[PDB]
């Protein structure tokens, strides 16, 4: 799962979707003209996503990825460097530890707050 943790980190830090094997839990259309549809694959999910907490967590991750991709498309940059904000996300190494601990929730909340701050700053100043 070293590849899956790296893919999740890339999706949560830059919003870049690269799933040539249909393994990631989220993928967008246009791979209506400007607004693309983001489809979630429950067959390749990491949790059940049935309870309200898990549903809100998945929605927060998807919103973070969407905001990152929108910021990238608006700034015409291939990636969002970490110096653009005061939040730095660490890459996942142990999938079992990330699943059993709340470090996943902490990283998700941090990246979501960073994406929301960047989006608000952009839409307020530019």
């Amino acid at each position: 799962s070293q590849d899956y943790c790296t893919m999740l980190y890339e999706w949560l830090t830059q919003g870049i979707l690269n799933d040539p094997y249909q393994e990631f839990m989220t993928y967008d259309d246009l791979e209506r003209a400007w607004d693309t549809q983001y489809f979630i694959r429950k067959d390749v999910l990491l949790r059940d996503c049935d309870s309200e907490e898990d549903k809100n967590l998945l929605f927060k991750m998807l919103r973070t990825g969407i905001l990152l991709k929108v910021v990238r498309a608006s700034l015409q940059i291939p990636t969002i460097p970490s110096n653009s904000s005061d939040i730095t996300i660490q890459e996942i190494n142990d999938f079992a530890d990330l699943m059993e601990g709340s470090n996943l929730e902490l990283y998700v909340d941090k990246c979501y707050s960073r994406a929301n701050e960047i989006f608000l700053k952009l839409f307020f100043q530019g």
Partner: protein
Amino acid sequence: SLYYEYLMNWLTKGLLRATYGEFFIAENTDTNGTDDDFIYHIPIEFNQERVPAFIPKELAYKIFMIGKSYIFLEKYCKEVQWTN
């Protein structure tokens, strides 16, 4: 060794997985109509004679109360960061 490991797991994360009836604290979701959605029921039960002889009943009750208060803080007070 595994008994103390399960005690550690319950005292830290409030988990009772892979117990197979080898613990003295469990959850009883059965409800007779009073507080079905567990607004104030706290459906956590604690057995007495399920503990060995080398552990005090007061210490077992303290462990049960620690787990109950941790679950309460994690479920009702939403103190996610502090509980983590």
